[PDB]
């Protein structure tokens, strides 16, 4: 069960700016979406931790011991053939 991730823009806002606090330092970025185009242009203060990954990486599925608490909807069949009187119970 590989677990894919994908990214996309939340806001339609074009102008971005902020401050980084990675460690014992800071950085300033600005970001502007190239309008009428799927693109984002950002620059941050020149370089001076843990990796993010986007490729699908192996993982166990969703916690199966938890999805059963609140399961998905389901409609079983309705023939349900059992409990007939005229049955020979002389086998064992």
């Amino acid at each position: 069960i590989t677990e894919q991730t994908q990214y996309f823009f939340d806001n339609d806002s074009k102008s971005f700016s902020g401050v980084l606090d990675c460690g014992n330092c800071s950085r300033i970025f600005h970001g502007e979406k190239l309008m009428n185009t799927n693109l984002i242009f950002i620059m941050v203060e020149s370089k001076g931790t843990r990796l993010l990954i986007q490729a699908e990486q192996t993982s166990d599925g969703p916690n199966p011991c938890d999805m059963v608490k609140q399961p998905r909807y389901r409609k079983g069949p309705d023939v349900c053939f059992d409990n007939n009187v005229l049955e020979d119970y002389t086998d064992c």
Binding site: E3, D10, C22, T37, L39, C65, R72, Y73, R74, P77
Partner: protein, 796 residues
């Protein structure tokens, strides 16, 4: 300017003739296809019913010979007195067929020539004349099969059986479904002191060999007792026995250990309590308590009096292992309650025993004479003769011997076998023609359990469960796990399971075909039940896919010049042309090699389906008029590395005819990730080539750029083609530097001013400078969705 997006819109608009923009009714489209699928699953119901009655009317008159030294039974044993057959290579089945007799498969340890079997090869030799009648009535009828309850399967189109043959019909999903109704199993493993040793290895093996006889519509739990009854797993109630729920139970049974005294009273008072738990949505009949143990003294009569007084629960008991404890009380428990008693002395005796209780559960089915012969379609699974993805319809055959003499005090309450008829999904994907839709639109269908039959994201490979380990289940993808979940597609699913017919238009995220981008879009989910079965054929259309260009063309001259347009020799002056391989009467699909098919296509149109071949020519001319008028004039624009166009209809053209060698996108237009991606946006899209692939690129290929081709032909919006160019990075590097990272959604680097970043082009921005992105994500830009792909492979 380079691509010619508005240099083509005129071409499509200029030829107002040669068009008829017709609408997809999206309600007469589902119903006309959900009535074709219902007709298919009804023809396979006549082939079944006509087969059950012939194998019930011949069993009645068999006379039970017991002497086959003479009058030897003649048959084609599948693994090779016998028949030497003649085999014709049939491309339909993908293997060798004979069509003149029915093969037989005796499992690898049922003696081929015992008396109980040699009769089975006799009265089932009268099926060969109704196997042949069924397909001769209607071809494309893949596998008739009679799954006799003595190991034998007599599947009609006789092929050699497909390394030890552990195949045994009495376990295949299409058998345990016909042979019994939904269960509520509850295994009571006896992990007490006395099972320590080998008896525990057989209990852990035999339990996991019984959870494999459970469908997706019958529940199960695995208790255990050693003077205190608990659950081996973490479930605490019945859990449906899915492909996944079983894995929790199997992996919790295997990690069990023997300890402490044995207490049958406190361990049966826990089993009968978990079968009364009526707020879990159980399958509300065939309650069972399959006790696994070695042997004891206490027949807990006061437990079977408090609970199970009126005999609703069946206590099957297994006395597993080699030992000398009293198997007396155990025999009483299975006899007093409406059960049966099985003995499992050692491995090998595990497979043949755990599948036997279906002969007991099927007793109240035989007595319900013909209210119980109902066709029943198994959830999608992988065929056991390398056919692909199939679904089988099951129908039990009962034993009518002495009937109408009213004898019926006999073994006349067991079934001969379940007999099935396979429908392949590649035969259901032909009743839902996809080509009058946009590449985004598609049909799909779901079980009443939610699992998708017929979904485009349903890869023909076994479903996955759990991370693998260092060292016969069906393909059951739930509808909410083949598509991105949201609180609106839950309403759609819950309204398709109930069988209601409606419609719902909403804006939803759609994952890109190459699992890298997510697109917001508008989708209209129409659905309608497939009367007469339990399915819900739905159809999802982009809001702009409500019209399609059906070409009218009968002049034979205009298509004549279209015909040589895409000849391989005219490629220098008319682009390197591809055609999507599509369904024609006799034209042969590629051998993974497009250029062979393009050569093939020309003869079949040179010699003389109608619409698909009529539409591809119109695109070829319409595309060619572009690649001759505009693309040829302004040849070799500076930043361009290649100029390409794709249409619904197959034609894909690239000008340089050298970049065509570097055209990675597959020739099928309806599967191109960018073509779906760009069809959904209303601007240009940049598809970053992957980073560090096996193949080369990203310098000699450039980076793709695409834009849809929107048309208002008669006030109606269409997007019937996608033109685009492959921008070389080097030319665009300078114009960038002449002015830092440029970036697209999905966080894929296209360029960076620093030229170590730009060396690893296309890598995920966040495997480069993760500290920025995690902060950059958290400013409400670059959202992320995290879905699961249950059908994929891993190395460990």
């Amino acid at each position: 300017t380079a691509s010619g997006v508005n240099q083509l819109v005129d071409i499509y608009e200029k030829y107002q003739d040669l068009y008829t923009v017709e609408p997809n009714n999206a309600r007469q489209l589902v119903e006309i296809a959900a009535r074709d699928i219902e007709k298919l699953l009804s023809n396979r119901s006549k082939a079944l019913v006509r087969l059950a009655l012939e194998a019930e009317k011949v069993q009645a008159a068999h006379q039970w010979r017991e002497d086959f030294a003479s009058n030897e039974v003649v048959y084609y044993n599948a693994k090779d007195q016998r028949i030497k057959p003649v085999f014709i290579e049939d491309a339909n089945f993908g293997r060798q067929i004979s069509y003149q007799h029915a093969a037989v498969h005796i499992p690898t340890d049922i003696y081929e020539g015992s008396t109980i079997v040699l009769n089975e090869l006799n009265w089932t030799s009268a099926l060969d004349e109704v196997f042949k009648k069924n397909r001769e009535e209607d071809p494309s009828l893949l596998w008739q099969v009679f799954g006799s309850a003595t190991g034998l399967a007599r599947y009609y189109p006789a092929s050699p059986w497909v390394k030890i043959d552990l195949y045994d019909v009495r376990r295949r999903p299409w058998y345990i479904q016909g042979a019994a109704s939904p269960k509520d199993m509850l295994i009571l493993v006896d992990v007490s002191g006395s099972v320590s040793g080998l008896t525990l290895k057989l209990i852990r093996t035999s339990v996991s060999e019984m959870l494999e006889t459970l469908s997706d519509d019958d529940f199960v739990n695995v208790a255990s007792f050693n003077s205190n009854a608990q659950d081996v797993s973490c479930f605490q109630h019945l859990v449906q026995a899915n492909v996944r729920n079983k894995k929790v139970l199997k992996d919790a049974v295997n990690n069990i250990t023997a300890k402490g005294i044995t207490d049958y009273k406190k361990g049966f008072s826990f089993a009968f309590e978990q079968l009364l738990n009526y707020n879990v949505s159980r399958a509300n009949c065939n309650k069972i308590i399959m006790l696994f143990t070695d042997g004891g003294e206490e027949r807990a009569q006061e437990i079977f009096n408090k609970y199970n007084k009126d005999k609703k629960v069946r206590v099957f008991t297994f006395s597993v292992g080699q030992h000398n404890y009293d198997r007396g009380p155990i025999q009483w428990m299975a006899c007093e309650n409406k059960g049966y008693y099985y003995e499992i002395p050692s491995i090998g005796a595990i497979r043949i025993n755990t599948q036997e209780y279906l002969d007991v559960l099927g007793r109240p089915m035989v007595l319900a004479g013909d209210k119980a012969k109902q066709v029943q379609w198994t959830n999608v699974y992988l065929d056991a003769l390398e056919l692909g993805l199939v679904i089988t319809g099951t129908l039990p055959v009962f034993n009518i011997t002495g009937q109408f003499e009213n004898k019926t005090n006999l073994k006349n309450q067991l079934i001969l076998g379940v007999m099935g008829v396979d429908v392949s999904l590649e035969d259901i994907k032909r009743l839902t023609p996809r080509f009058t839709l946009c590449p985004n639109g598609y049909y799909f269908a779901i079980d009443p359990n939610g699992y998708v039959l017929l979904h485009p994201n349903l890869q023909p490979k076994p479903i996955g469960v759990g991370i693998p380990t260092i060292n016969q289940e069906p393909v059951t993808l739930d509808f909410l796990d083949a598509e991105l979940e949201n609180d609106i597609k839950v309403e759609i699913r819950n309204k398709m399971i109930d069988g209601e017919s409606g419609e719902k238009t909403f804006r939803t995220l759609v994952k890109s075909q190459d699992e890298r981008y997510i697109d917001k879009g508008n989708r209209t989910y129409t659905w309608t039940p497939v009367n007469g079965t339990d399915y819900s054929l739905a159809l999802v259309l982009p809001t702009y896919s409500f019209y399609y260009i059906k070409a009218k063309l009968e002049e034979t001259i205009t298509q004549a010049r279209y015909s040589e347009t895409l000849k391989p020799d005219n490629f220098e002056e008319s682009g390197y042309t591809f055609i999507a391989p599509r369904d024609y009467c006799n034209d042969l699909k590629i051998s993974d090699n497009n250029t062979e098919f393009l050569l093939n296509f020309n003869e079949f149109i040179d010699r003389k389906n109608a619409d698909l071949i009529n539409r591809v020519l119109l695109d070829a001319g319409f595309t060619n008029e572009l690649v001759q008028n505009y693309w040829s004039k302004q040849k070799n624009i500076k930043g361009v590395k290649a100029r390409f166009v794709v249409t619904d209809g197959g034609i894909t053209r690239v000008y340089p005819k050298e970049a065509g060698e570097n055209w990675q996108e597959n020739p099928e237009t309806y599967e191109d990730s960018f073509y779906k991606r760009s069809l959904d946006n209303d601007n240009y899209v940049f598809t970053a080539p992957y980073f560090n692939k096996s193949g080369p690129g990203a310098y000699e290929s450039g980076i793709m750029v695409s834009k849809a081709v929107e048309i208002y032909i008669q006030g109606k919006l269409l997007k019937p083609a996608v033109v685009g160019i492959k921008i070389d990075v080097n030319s665009w590097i300078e114009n960038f530097t002449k002015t830092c990272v440029i970036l697209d959604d999905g966080g894929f680097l296209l360029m960076a001013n620093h030229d170590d970043y730009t060396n690893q082009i296309g890598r995920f921005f966040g495997e480069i400078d993760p500290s920025l992105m995690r902060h950059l994500v958290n400013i409400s830009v670059y959202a992320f969705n995290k879905s699961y792909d249950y059908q994929s492979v891993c190395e460990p």
